Amino acid sequence: PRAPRTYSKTYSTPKRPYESSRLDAELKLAGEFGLKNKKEIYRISFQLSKIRRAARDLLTRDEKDPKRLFEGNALIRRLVRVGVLSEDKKKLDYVLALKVEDFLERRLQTQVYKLGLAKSVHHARVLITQR
Amino acid sequence: ARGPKKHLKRLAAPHHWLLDKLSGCYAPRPSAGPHKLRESLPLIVFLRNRLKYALNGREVKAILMQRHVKVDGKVRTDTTYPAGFMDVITLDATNENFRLVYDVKGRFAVHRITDEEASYKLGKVKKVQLGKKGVPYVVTHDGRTIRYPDPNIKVNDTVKIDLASGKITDFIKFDAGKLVYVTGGRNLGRIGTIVHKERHDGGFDLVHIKDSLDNTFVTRLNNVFVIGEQGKPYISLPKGKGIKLSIAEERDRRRAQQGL
Amino acid sequence: GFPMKQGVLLPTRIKLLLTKNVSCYRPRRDGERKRKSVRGAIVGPDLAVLALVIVKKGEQELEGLTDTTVPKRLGPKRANNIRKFFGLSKEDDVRDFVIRREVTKGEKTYTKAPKIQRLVTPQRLQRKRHQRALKVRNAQAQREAAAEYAQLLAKRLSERKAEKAEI
Amino acid sequence: STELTVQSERAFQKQPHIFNNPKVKTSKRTKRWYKNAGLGFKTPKTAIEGSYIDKKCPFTGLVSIRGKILTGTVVSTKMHRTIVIRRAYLHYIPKYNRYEKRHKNVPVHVSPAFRVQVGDIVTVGQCRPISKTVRFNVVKVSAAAGXXXXXXXXX
Amino acid sequence: GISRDSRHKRSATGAKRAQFRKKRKFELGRQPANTKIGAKRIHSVRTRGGNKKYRALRIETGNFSWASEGISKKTRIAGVVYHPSNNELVRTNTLTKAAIVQIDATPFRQWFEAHYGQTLGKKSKNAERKWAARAASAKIESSVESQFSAGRLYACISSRPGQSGRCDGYILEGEELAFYLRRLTAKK
RNA sequence: GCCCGUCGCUAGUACCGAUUGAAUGGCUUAGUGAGGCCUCAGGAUCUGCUUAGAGAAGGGGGCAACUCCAUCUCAGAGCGGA
RNA sequence: GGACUUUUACUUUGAAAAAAUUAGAGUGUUCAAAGCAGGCGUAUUGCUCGAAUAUAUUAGCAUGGAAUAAUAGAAUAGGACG
RNA sequence: UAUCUGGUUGAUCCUGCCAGUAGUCAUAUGCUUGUCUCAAAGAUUAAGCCAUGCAUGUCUAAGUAUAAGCAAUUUAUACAGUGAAACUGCGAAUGGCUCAUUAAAUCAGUUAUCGUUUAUUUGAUAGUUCCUUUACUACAUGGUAUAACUGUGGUAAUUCUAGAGCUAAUACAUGCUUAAAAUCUCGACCCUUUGGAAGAGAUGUAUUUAUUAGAUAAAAAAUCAAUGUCUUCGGACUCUUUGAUGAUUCAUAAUAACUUUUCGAAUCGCAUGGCCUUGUGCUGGCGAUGGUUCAUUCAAAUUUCUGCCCUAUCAACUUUCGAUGGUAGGAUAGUGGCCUACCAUGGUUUCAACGGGUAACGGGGAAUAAGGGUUCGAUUCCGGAGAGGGAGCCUGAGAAACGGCUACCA
Ligand SMILES: [Mg+2]
Ligand SMILES: [Mg+2]
Ligand SMILES: [Mg+2]
Ligand SMILES: [Mg+2]
Ligand SMILES: [Mg+2]
Ligand SMILES: [Mg+2]
Ligand SMILES: [Mg+2]
Ligand SMILES: [Mg+2]
Ligand SMILES: [Mg+2]
Ligand SMILES: [Mg+2]
Ligand SMILES: [Mg+2]
Ligand SMILES: [Mg+2]
Ligand SMILES: [Mg+2]
Ligand SMILES: [Mg+2]
Ligand SMILES: [Mg+2]
Ligand SMILES: [Mg+2]
Ligand SMILES: [Mg+2]
Ligand SMILES: [Mg+2]
Ligand SMILES: [Mg+2]
Ligand SMILES: [Mg+2]
Ligand SMILES: [Mg+2]
Ligand SMILES: [Mg+2]
Ligand SMILES: [Mg+2]
Ligand SMILES: [Mg+2]
Ligand SMILES: [Mg+2]
Ligand SMILES: [Mg+2]
Ligand SMILES: [Mg+2]
Ligand SMILES: [Mg+2]
């Protein structure tokens, strides 16, 4: 008898199971940004899934509707605030757009490489984890 | 279920107490008294969760059992004393004087008041009757019983109270156009002058309200507390003066006050 | 070992339902009863032990009984009870007629005494005093608030007369 | 339903604490009592005129009406001084997003201060538990008969 | 024991209803006092929430009031003569509310032949004034004065003797008396 | 070419079936009826209130006459309680 | 305050409305699952934002609507107003 | 977050199911297993059975202390510090577990008490107690009977207990009291009028009964019976007073009485002071426990409207031994066929009664993501039921209690 420690999981695994094309693309994305799982991709594309979802749902509501404005602007400002969404396309018909790579390009893994400091994505992995 | 319940689980506990989910499994169960369970504020919540004056519960019993706190006049030695709306929590030491009053969010707020406003109180006369030996009386929402009141004193009126003695020093009727603090509903906390009473014989009389921001709304007469004249209040309201800014209004205000 | 119980007759044993205040049962809970066995009130050879009580002393002193006397442990603790173990009339002052028990602290021999309850003392008279006082006081107070209201209503009626006169 | 007799029981029938003094030469023999129920259902003239007792009458009885006020279209009067109405409605099933014809039969008490036949729409109001099943009592007849005398013989 | 619930009992459709929970004290009932006559013998009972109820097995005297005379006296209760619920209560001379009893009569005579100075059936100065101010106001009534001749007045009970330990009532009169008389003799 | 039915072997499932077959559970007639509760009684003991005697106390205030309250102690008697 | 009121369905808005769940805002638990925290200086004797909003439907109450679909009304005139 | 793929033919295109595919706050099991945080867990089967231990007891300056208890000191020759045992008081009805029965029951949203109980908390509330009423009733305080204890005992055995000897109270059982005023009844006298009167009793609260007030829907009169205040003695009465609700016989009050008479402080702790007619007079500070009636608060009990899974291989059900209604009582805390008595023949049903099945507690909810749906909820919160099966009950404010008792079955 204590408050239920809540949770929820953080990934969405592939509908189809053995799709060559998608597998290729996955292994690519892993091999660029230095990831170990396909799950590390699943998780990402899932966050993407929910986000784009509420985007659609907001965009069915009427323009200049209270919810649409509050949560729309909130979502946008949030996305940008960590640097995934472009300042230019700052009105959520491009948050509906987006894509996965754009999400990937914000990882500490990656940034610790983009500005040198590692010269190798895997060196990024190991350096990061090693204090 | 064979008798009365003497425990209170968390999550059962009224949300307007603002307790956190973990940290245990129960909350303090309000005792019996002046204010109803589902709409009060036990001394321990206040002295621990609102003021952060004591860290434990043990320390609240420690403080209390030394008569530092006194309620509406008297001392009170009940960790879970049911303190509620319109009351007065005095700290004799520390020099501090509190009136228990609601937010706009509908929560009980800490609110610092004067040494002198802490000498009296306001009580909505919930009932007015005739008693033994002819003595009429009036009884107020905090369970005050006052013998011999002004015959003009009805039901749904409000009343200024000595605290020093008991007696009523002045009373405000329930008329079209009078300052009203809403106790209960979603519009609990808002304050808005009164437009007009929808009668409805037999059940649930309605009260039409509008604040000083030309916004309207409606609540049961049940949940209406007469507190004065347009602009002229009879006690020190708290910040925000119960006006209810929109989600947008508060996103802008809270995020305009941003310069360091 | 089962005990007897006065007035059950029957030279046998039976199983009665017992209560508070009754022989051969001390309860364990407020309004508890147990049904227990009992031996009758009619003597038989089934009896391990008779328990008897002298009422007339015969013609020969039994050794460890009519040769020895043994005190009654305690003495009178209540006001009048003392006054009736000495017969004093509510006059001769209790305080010194009480029973004082000696006992040694090795070389510090002490003497201890009861606590004469229901003794008449100044403090109790002060309390009686304040009772009656508080009563009359609040009574008068009531009368006066009552009058005050009476006026209130009377010179409210005066106001209705004035208002009814205005038109 | 009653009709006739009034004093037709093993017990004497009368209103409670309504002393009529015999020493005084009254013109109406029996002093009567009554009220109006509230909410605006005129305590009909048949009640004050009448001679009956029924301490379950909402106007001459000692049973107060409060709570739900319902209407319903009477379908049973075979029970002395009480009747059964069939209140009808349409119930909404979500899956099909439609309605089905439903109904329930409430037994109500009815003071003889109303004459009723089957067909007449009625307006009843909740009172205390009166019988095992009677939780309501008759307060207005929003009808009359439904043209029975306009169903007469020939020219 | 006796449970005044409605969880026994068929539904109004006559369906048969299942044991749901056992018997509880709060829905209980207790047995009849079946109060009788002679030698006051009352036993309290520990009702719910502290509170006594006074259950009166056997009574003899009761407080009976002359409704249209302004008084109330105490009298030996004679017997019970008529009862609308059950004839047995009559043969068994049981006392319950609304039982038709007979009473002493003589106290109401001692009061009447004092306050009125008229004497039923068949000297002081102030007194003269009183008895003088009181008449055409002393026609009494036929049947009532008749019962006064009998020595035995018909009255109706009002109290619940198996609840309050009391036996109280009002003398029969007028239409009520008319009723219980016509019943008294069309069963005589 | 396909393919149908009896017949024959192996294995599995269900069905009918003497035994008025068997078992479990839930209601229930009739008969029997523990126990607490209520009530009429009972009276192991154990005191009340009233009536009177005998031995002494304490005085409402007198020179003899006169007289209340409480308290203990046994032959003996009326009206109730535990 | 008196005197009376044809019955309904739909729909609107709203009152009444537990928390935890869920959708969701704020906040960088080092991330995240979460949590309802925390954030500012004179970090020597305090300053301070919070602890939102949304759903909550069937029924019941309350309120606007008068389309769509019913229901009742005057024909042996026992009609309508005064 | 709106997809399909294999398998019927020589080939084909359909119908169609099998298999594949994905997730499961969905169990299990096999293989493997390094770090952080998080952390469900004897539900399903068998509400089957249980060894041992523990899970309910509790004290303030303030009810009871002659421990033959410890401490001694610090004023205490009645008590006083501290305090075992015991008495008294309160609690043990919360909690925790389980989900067996339960299918209009529970539960849910929504009503009801003008239909009841209520420990406690908080706010109020009490001058009335005696008696033929001057030779008075303890009020400066009335009664014993009990544990513990001491001592004598019994049984193989238990939270078994007997006989004897003491003694406490906020236990048990009693029992005094307080101002004024008024209104009611009687009424000794005196005197004839139009009539008045010394003074005698009664009148706290509660209980029971009968009667009465409690107005108001706009305004005026004559007369019978009583009968109130003021005479400018034909006469007048003028001002006249009223609560709450949609709604009452409501709150509230008055009259005649009723009652093995409810309550109306025989309690406790810290201080000790004023004040003269110097009585240990007469008063008096803070606050504790109580106490009747009212209100509150925690509750409870019933209760209105609507909503439940499959089933016709269940179509009629309901009164044997209440089924539906009426009158009266009895019972209850209280309404009510809850029960009894008499009286009647009613109540439900194809708009599915009634019966059956549920590997059925109801909800908040969970899972599955076009939507509409489909499946699930024993299980952290709410509500309910039970404690191996039943039934019965004592105590109490509160239980049909089971870490309570009594009986039956096992
Ligand atoms: Mg508490
Ligand atoms: Mg209401
Ligand atoms: Mg004492
Ligand atoms: Mg009938
Ligand atoms: Mg009997
Ligand atoms: Mg078998
Ligand atoms: Mg038997
Ligand atoms: Mg689809
Ligand atoms: Mg093939
Ligand atoms: Mg071929
Ligand atoms: Mg199990
Ligand atoms: Mg000592
Ligand atoms: Mg519990
Ligand atoms: Mg004794
Ligand atoms: Mg009946
Ligand atoms: Mg009843
Ligand atoms: Mg029927
Ligand atoms: Mg089940
Ligand atoms: Mg289910
Ligand atoms: Mg469940
Ligand atoms: Mg199960
Ligand atoms: Mg479990
Ligand atoms: Mg139980
Ligand atoms: Mg078991
Ligand atoms: Mg049990
Ligand atoms: Mg156990
Ligand atoms: Mg238990
Ligand atoms: Mg057997």
Short mmCIF file of all heavy atoms in Angstrom, two decimals, chain F residues 58-72:
data_model
loop_
_atom_site.label_atom_id
_atom_site.label_comp_id
_atom_site.label_asym_id
_atom_site.label_seq_id
_atom_site.Cartn_x
_atom_site.Cartn_y
_atom_site.Cartn_z
P G F 58 -22.38 11.18 76.89
OP1 G F 58 -20.98 11.56 77.21
OP2 G F 58 -23.37 11.11 78.00
"O5'" G F 58 -22.93 12.19 75.79
"C5'" G F 58 -22.23 12.40 74.57
"C4'" G F 58 -23.12 13.02 73.53
"O4'" G F 58 -24.07 12.04 73.04
"C3'" G F 58 -24.00 14.17 74.01
"O3'" G F 58 -23.31 15.40 74.08
"C2'" G F 58 -25.15 14.15 73.01
"O2'" G F 58 -24.75 14.77 71.80
"C1'" G F 58 -25.31 12.65 72.76
N9 G F 58 -26.34 12.04 73.62
C8 G F 58 -26.18 11.71 74.95
N7 G F 58 -27.25 11.19 75.49
C5 G F 58 -28.18 11.18 74.46
C6 G F 58 -29.53 10.73 74.46
O6 G F 58 -30.19 10.23 75.39
N1 G F 58 -30.13 10.89 73.22
C2 G F 58 -29.51 11.43 72.12
N2 G F 58 -30.28 11.49 71.02
N3 G F 58 -28.25 11.86 72.10
C4 G F 58 -27.64 11.71 73.30
P G F 59 -23.85 16.59 75.03
OP1 G F 59 -22.68 17.40 75.47
OP2 G F 59 -24.73 15.98 76.06
"O5'" G F 59 -24.75 17.47 74.06
"C5'" G F 59 -25.62 18.48 74.57
"C4'" G F 59 -26.98 18.44 73.90
"O4'" G F 59 -27.54 17.11 74.06
"C3'" G F 59 -28.01 19.41 74.47
"O3'" G F 59 -28.93 19.79 73.44
"C2'" G F 59 -28.74 18.54 75.49
"O2'" G F 59 -30.04 18.99 75.82
"C1'" G F 59 -28.77 17.19 74.77
N9 G F 59 -28.85 16.03 75.66
C8 G F 59 -27.99 15.67 76.67
N7 G F 59 -28.34 14.56 77.27
C5 G F 59 -29.50 14.17 76.62
C6 G F 59 -30.35 13.04 76.83
O6 G F 59 -30.24 12.13 77.66
N1 G F 59 -31.42 13.04 75.93
C2 G F 59 -31.65 13.99 74.96
N2 G F 59 -32.74 13.81 74.20
N3 G F 59 -30.87 15.04 74.76
C4 G F 59 -29.83 15.06 75.62
P G F 60 -28.42 20.10 71.95
OP1 G F 60 -28.51 18.83 71.18
OP2 G F 60 -27.14 20.86 71.99
"O5'" G F 60 -29.53 21.09 71.36
"C5'" G F 60 -30.26 21.98 72.20
"C4'" G F 60 -31.66 22.18 71.69
"O4'" G F 60 -32.28 20.87 71.49
"C3'" G F 60 -32.64 22.92 72.60
"O3'" G F 60 -32.51 24.34 72.56
"C2'" G F 60 -33.98 22.37 72.14
"O2'" G F 60 -34.35 22.93 70.88
"C1'" G F 60 -33.63 20.90 71.91
N9 G F 60 -33.71 20.10 73.15
C8 G F 60 -32.88 19.04 73.44
N7 G F 60 -33.12 18.47 74.58
C5 G F 60 -34.19 19.18 75.10
C6 G F 60 -34.89 19.01 76.33
O6 G F 60 -34.68 18.17 77.22
N1 G F 60 -35.91 19.94 76.48
C2 G F 60 -36.23 20.92 75.57
N2 G F 60 -37.26 21.72 75.89
N3 G F 60 -35.59 21.08 74.42
C4 G F 60 -34.58 20.19 74.24
P G F 61 -33.70 25.34 73.03
OP1 G F 61 -34.79 24.64 73.77
OP2 G F 61 -34.07 26.11 71.81
"O5'" G F 61 -33.03 26.37 74.05
"C5'" G F 61 -32.38 25.96 75.26
"C4'" G F 61 -33.34 25.46 76.32
"O4'" G F 61 -33.12 24.03 76.49
"C3'" G F 61 -33.18 26.08 77.72
"O3'" G F 61 -34.48 26.15 78.35
"C2'" G F 61 -32.20 25.09 78.37
"O2'" G F 61 -32.11 25.11 79.78
"C1'" G F 61 -32.71 23.76 77.82
N9 G F 61 -31.69 22.70 77.81
C8 G F 61 -30.54 22.65 77.06
N7 G F 61 -29.83 21.58 77.28
C5 G F 61 -30.56 20.88 78.24
C6 G F 61 -30.28 19.64 78.86
O6 G F 61 -29.32 18.89 78.70
N1 G F 61 -31.28 19.29 79.77
C2 G F 61 -32.39 20.04 80.04
N2 G F 61 -33.23 19.53 80.95
N3 G F 61 -32.66 21.20 79.46
C4 G F 61 -31.71 21.56 78.57
P G F 62 -34.90 25.64 79.85
OP1 G F 62 -34.54 24.23 80.10
OP2 G F 62 -36.33 25.99 79.96
"O5'" G F 62 -34.16 26.62 80.89
"C5'" G F 62 -33.66 26.17 82.15
"C4'" G F 62 -34.75 25.71 83.11
"O4'" G F 62 -35.28 24.43 82.66
"C3'" G F 62 -34.30 25.42 84.55
"O3'" G F 62 -34.18 26.57 85.39
"C2'" G F 62 -35.35 24.43 85.03
"O2'" G F 62 -36.57 25.09 85.31
"C1'" G F 62 -35.54 23.59 83.77
N9 G F 62 -34.59 22.45 83.72
C8 G F 62 -33.25 22.48 83.40
N7 G F 62 -32.66 21.32 83.45
C5 G F 62 -33.66 20.44 83.85
C6 G F 62 -33.61 19.04 84.07
O6 G F 62 -32.64 18.27 83.96
N1 G F 62 -34.85 18.55 84.45
C2 G F 62 -35.99 19.31 84.60
N2 G F 62 -37.10 18.65 84.97
N3 G F 62 -36.05 20.61 84.39
C4 G F 62 -34.86 21.12 84.02
P C F 63 -33.17 26.57 86.65
OP1 C F 63 -33.23 27.91 87.28
OP2 C F 63 -31.85 26.05 86.20
"O5'" C F 63 -33.80 25.52 87.69
"C5'" C F 63 -33.30 24.19 87.82
"C4'" C F 63 -33.70 23.56 89.14
"O4'" C F 63 -34.73 24.36 89.77
"C3'" C F 63 -34.30 22.15 89.10
"O3'" C F 63 -33.33 21.11 88.98
"C2'" C F 63 -35.09 22.10 90.40
"O2'" C F 63 -34.24 21.85 91.51
"C1'" C F 63 -35.61 23.54 90.50
N1 C F 63 -36.98 23.69 89.95
C2 C F 63 -38.08 23.31 90.74
O2 C F 63 -37.88 22.86 91.88
N3 C F 63 -39.33 23.44 90.24
C4 C F 63 -39.52 23.93 89.01
N4 C F 63 -40.78 24.04 88.57
C5 C F 63 -38.43 24.32 88.19
C6 C F 63 -37.20 24.18 88.69
P A F 64 -33.76 19.57 88.72
OP1 A F 64 -33.37 18.79 89.93
OP2 A F 64 -33.23 19.14 87.40
"O5'" A F 64 -35.35 19.59 88.64
"C5'" A F 64 -36.10 18.53 88.04
"C4'" A F 64 -37.18 18.00 88.96
"O4'" A F 64 -37.92 19.10 89.55
"C3'" A F 64 -38.25 17.13 88.33
"O3'" A F 64 -37.80 15.80 88.07
"C2'" A F 64 -39.40 17.24 89.33
"O2'" A F 64 -39.21 16.36 90.43
"C1'" A F 64 -39.25 18.68 89.82
N9 A F 64 -40.21 19.62 89.19
C8 A F 64 -39.93 20.69 88.38
N7 A F 64 -40.99 21.35 87.98
C5 A F 64 -42.05 20.67 88.58
C6 A F 64 -43.44 20.87 88.55
N6 A F 64 -44.04 21.85 87.87
N1 A F 64 -44.22 20.02 89.25
C2 A F 64 -43.62 19.03 89.93
N3 A F 64 -42.33 18.74 90.04
C4 A F 64 -41.58 19.61 89.33
P A F 65 -38.75 14.66 87.40
OP1 A F 65 -40.14 14.73 87.92
OP2 A F 65 -38.00 13.39 87.58
"O5'" A F 65 -38.74 14.94 85.82
"C5'" A F 65 -39.20 16.16 85.25
"C4'" A F 65 -40.71 16.25 85.17
"O4'" A F 65 -41.14 17.58 85.56
"C3'" A F 65 -41.33 16.05 83.78
"O3'" A F 65 -41.47 14.68 83.43
"C2'" A F 65 -42.65 16.79 83.90
"O2'" A F 65 -43.63 16.01 84.56
"C1'" A F 65 -42.27 17.97 84.81
N9 A F 65 -41.95 19.19 84.04
C8 A F 65 -40.78 19.51 83.39
N7 A F 65 -40.80 20.67 82.79
C5 A F 65 -42.08 21.17 83.05
C6 A F 65 -42.73 22.36 82.68
N6 A F 65 -42.17 23.33 81.95
N1 A F 65 -44.00 22.54 83.10
C2 A F 65 -44.57 21.58 83.84
N3 A F 65 -44.07 20.41 84.25
C4 A F 65 -42.80 20.26 83.81
P C F 66 -41.03 14.14 81.97
OP1 C F 66 -42.05 13.16 81.51
OP2 C F 66 -39.60 13.71 82.06
"O5'" C F 66 -41.09 15.42 81.03
"C5'" C F 66 -42.27 15.78 80.32
"C4'" C F 66 -42.04 17.06 79.54
"O4'" C F 66 -41.16 17.92 80.31
"C3'" C F 66 -41.34 16.90 78.19
"O3'" C F 66 -42.25 16.62 77.13
"C2'" C F 66 -40.60 18.23 78.02
"O2'" C F 66 -41.49 19.23 77.54
"C1'" C F 66 -40.24 18.57 79.47
N1 C F 66 -38.87 18.13 79.84
C2 C F 66 -37.76 18.79 79.34
O2 C F 66 -37.92 19.75 78.57
N3 C F 66 -36.52 18.37 79.70
C4 C F 66 -36.37 17.33 80.53
N4 C F 66 -35.13 16.95 80.86
C5 C F 66 -37.49 16.64 81.06
C6 C F 66 -38.70 17.07 80.70
P U F 67 -41.86 15.60 75.94
OP1 U F 67 -42.96 15.63 74.94
OP2 U F 67 -41.46 14.30 76.54
"O5'" U F 67 -40.58 16.25 75.26
"C5'" U F 67 -40.62 16.71 73.92
"C4'" U F 67 -39.23 16.81 73.34
"O4'" U F 67 -38.33 17.35 74.34
"C3'" U F 67 -38.58 15.50 72.91
"O3'" U F 67 -39.01 15.08 71.62
"C2'" U F 67 -37.09 15.83 73.00
"O2'" U F 67 -36.67 16.56 71.86
"C1'" U F 67 -37.05 16.76 74.21
N1 U F 67 -36.72 16.07 75.48
C2 U F 67 -35.40 15.70 75.71
O2 U F 67 -34.50 15.90 74.91
N3 U F 67 -35.18 15.07 76.91
C4 U F 67 -36.11 14.80 77.90
O4 U F 67 -35.76 14.23 78.93
C5 U F 67 -37.44 15.22 77.59
C6 U F 67 -37.69 15.82 76.42
P C F 68 -38.48 13.71 70.95
OP1 C F 68 -39.63 13.08 70.27
OP2 C F 68 -37.74 12.92 71.97
"O5'" C F 68 -37.47 14.21 69.82
"C5'" C F 68 -37.94 14.99 68.72
"C4'" C F 68 -36.83 15.72 67.99
"O4'" C F 68 -35.98 16.44 68.92
"C3'" C F 68 -35.85 14.88 67.19
"O3'" C F 68 -36.37 14.45 65.95
"C2'" C F 68 -34.64 15.81 67.06
"O2'" C F 68 -34.85 16.76 66.03
"C1'" C F 68 -34.67 16.54 68.40
N1 C F 68 -33.70 15.99 69.38
C2 C F 68 -32.39 16.47 69.35
O2 C F 68 -32.09 17.33 68.50
N3 C F 68 -31.47 16.00 70.23
C4 C F 68 -31.83 15.08 71.13
N4 C F 68 -30.89 14.65 71.97
C5 C F 68 -33.16 14.57 71.19
C6 C F 68 -34.05 15.05 70.31
P C F 69 -35.96 13.02 65.34
OP1 C F 69 -36.76 12.79 64.10
OP2 C F 69 -36.02 12.02 66.43
"O5'" C F 69 -34.43 13.21 64.93
"C5'" C F 69 -34.08 14.15 63.93
"C4'" C F 69 -32.59 14.15 63.64
"O4'" C F 69 -31.88 14.92 64.64
"C3'" C F 69 -31.88 12.81 63.63
"O3'" C F 69 -32.12 12.07 62.44
"C2'" C F 69 -30.42 13.22 63.81
"O2'" C F 69 -29.84 13.61 62.58
"C1'" C F 69 -30.54 14.47 64.70
N1 C F 69 -30.15 14.21 66.11
C2 C F 69 -28.82 14.47 66.44
O2 C F 69 -28.05 14.89 65.56
N3 C F 69 -28.40 14.26 67.70
C4 C F 69 -29.26 13.81 68.62
N4 C F 69 -28.79 13.63 69.85
C5 C F 69 -30.63 13.54 68.30
C6 C F 69 -31.03 13.75 67.04
P A F 70 -32.11 10.46 62.44
OP1 A F 70 -32.78 9.99 61.20
OP2 A F 70 -32.62 10.00 63.76
"O5'" A F 70 -30.57 10.08 62.34
"C5'" A F 70 -29.78 10.51 61.23
"C4'" A F 70 -28.31 10.56 61.58
"O4'" A F 70 -28.09 11.50 62.67
"C3'" A F 70 -27.70 9.27 62.09
"O3'" A F 70 -27.39 8.34 61.06
"C2'" A F 70 -26.49 9.76 62.87
"O2'" A F 70 -25.44 10.15 61.99
"C1'" A F 70 -27.06 11.03 63.51
N9 A F 70 -27.63 10.74 64.85
C8 A F 70 -28.85 10.19 65.16
N7 A F 70 -29.07 10.04 66.45
C5 A F 70 -27.90 10.53 67.03
C6 A F 70 -27.50 10.65 68.37
N6 A F 70 -28.25 10.27 69.41
N1 A F 70 -26.27 11.17 68.62
C2 A F 70 -25.51 11.55 67.58
N3 A F 70 -25.78 11.48 66.28
C4 A F 70 -27.00 10.95 66.06
P U F 71 -27.85 6.80 61.19
OP1 U F 71 -27.75 6.18 59.85
OP2 U F 71 -29.15 6.76 61.91
"O5'" U F 71 -26.74 6.15 62.13
"C5'" U F 71 -25.37 6.11 61.74
"C4'" U F 71 -24.45 5.77 62.89
"O4'" U F 71 -24.52 6.81 63.90
"C3'" U F 71 -24.77 4.49 63.64
"O3'" U F 71 -24.28 3.33 62.99
"C2'" U F 71 -24.15 4.74 65.01
"O2'" U F 71 -22.74 4.53 64.97
"C1'" U F 71 -24.40 6.24 65.19
N1 U F 71 -25.63 6.53 65.96
C2 U F 71 -25.55 6.54 67.34
O2 U F 71 -24.51 6.31 67.93
N3 U F 71 -26.73 6.83 67.99
C4 U F 71 -27.96 7.11 67.41
O4 U F 71 -28.94 7.36 68.12
C5 U F 71 -27.96 7.08 65.98
C6 U F 71 -26.83 6.80 65.32
P C F 72 -25.28 2.15 62.55
OP1 C F 72 -24.96 1.79 61.14
OP2 C F 72 -26.66 2.56 62.89
"O5'" C F 72 -24.86 0.93 63.49
"C5'" C F 72 -23.52 0.46 63.55
"C4'" C F 72 -23.05 0.27 64.97
"O4'" C F 72 -23.50 1.38 65.79
"C3'" C F 72 -23.56 -0.97 65.70
"O3'" C F 72 -22.80 -2.13 65.40
"C2'" C F 72 -23.49 -0.56 67.17
"O2'" C F 72 -22.17 -0.70 67.67
"C1'" C F 72 -23.82 0.94 67.09
N1 C F 72 -25.25 1.22 67.35
C2 C F 72 -25.71 1.26 68.68
O2 C F 72 -24.91 1.04 69.60
N3 C F 72 -27.02 1.53 68.92
C4 C F 72 -27.85 1.76 67.90
N4 C F 72 -29.13 2.02 68.18
C5 C F 72 -27.41 1.74 66.55
C6 C F 72 -26.12 1.47 66.33
#
